[PDB]
Design brief:
The structure is cut from a larger assembly and holds chains A and B. By secondary structure, chain A is mostly helical. Chain A has helices spanning 2-15, 18-28, 38-44, 50-63. The longest helix of chain A is centred in the N-terminal third of the chain and has 14 residues, at 2-15. Chain B: It comes from Escherichia coli O157:H7.
Chain lengths: 78, 50
């Protein structure tokens, strides 16, 4: 189920916008070693840090839809 | 399990029971069930096989 969840999250990040995928990977430590903080993401990508939170809120609003997470609703019990 | 007398068949088969065939061919009926598309994930296939 972990190996299937990896491919499922890879397909979800590939189905969305590529820059959204890079933010969601380098934010929580997906496909990286360390999880970068908000100041480190601000030093890497762009100075504005409130727009990063707006991007995160927009990504959560796009990922609350059941049609894009119907294969992930079965993984909710784990 | 306990052997049981019955010819019942041709010589190339010998009477394997039902529940042991359900238990021992269980990852096979995950693998040939997830490919054909009667389930979303294998975690749902857990519930669909119990």
């Amino acid at each position: 189920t972990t190996e299937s969840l990896r491919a499922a999250t890879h397909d979800v990040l590939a189905g969305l916008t590529a820059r959204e995928a890079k933010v969601l990977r380098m934010r929580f430590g997906i496909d990286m070693n360390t999880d970068y903080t908000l100041e480190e993401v601000g030093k890497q990508f762009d100075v504005t840090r409130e727009r990063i939170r707006q991007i995160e809120a927009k990504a959560l609003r796009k990922l609350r839809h059941p049609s894009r997470s119907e294969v992930l609703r079965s993984f909710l019990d784990d | 399990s306990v052997i049981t007398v019955g010819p019942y068949l041709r010589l190339h088969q010998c009477g394997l029971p039902k529940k042991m065939a359900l238990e021992l061919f269980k990852p096979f009926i995950y693998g040939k069930l997830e490919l054909r598309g009667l389930a979303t994930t294998i975690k749902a296939a857990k519930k669909m096989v119990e």
